[PDB]
Write a protein that binds this ligand. Structure first.
Ligand code: CL
Ligand code: CL
Ligand code: CL
Length: 129
């Protein structure tokens, strides 16, 4: 599913991501924009052989099981395929664990490089939330 910008903001809020660990909704929407362009089915293969999955490009080295990332963990206790669903529940619940892991949203390199320090509220501007 490719979400609309406000549609995704609303879904993230519904699932308790808004201001989670102090990160406003615009941060999460911005991260999703640059990780996946709001496409739940996004996948990308990393140089180390791991793969990133879903709207927040969650990585199989630590967070989910895909059966083909040697030496990896599955800390969210989910198949990576769950992160591709039109229902963002699994992605949100896993993101909550990731952002609580110590480095906040810096876990998402694209958030650090493209969202951090910017006017992230622009991502939820105009949205009925
Ligand atoms: Cl915001
Ligand atoms: Cl594996
Ligand atoms: Cl980047």
């Amino acid at each position: 599913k490719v979400f609309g910008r406000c549609e995704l903001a609303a879904a993230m809020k519904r699932h308790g991501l808004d201001n989670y660990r102090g990160y406003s909704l615009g941060n999460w929407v911005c991260a999703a924009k640059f990780e996946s362009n709001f496409n739940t089915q996004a996948t990308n293969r990393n140089t180390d052989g791991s793969t990133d999955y879903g709207i927040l490009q969650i990585n199989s080295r630590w967070w989910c099981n895909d059966g083909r990332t040697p030496g990896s963990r599955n800390l969210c206790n989910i198949p990576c395929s769950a992160l591709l669903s039109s229902d963002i529940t699994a992605s949100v619940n896993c993101a909550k664990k990731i952002v609580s892991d110590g480095n906040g949203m810096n876990a998402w390199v694209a958030w650090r490089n493209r969202c951090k320090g910017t006017d992230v509220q622009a991502w939820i501007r105009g949205c009925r939330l």
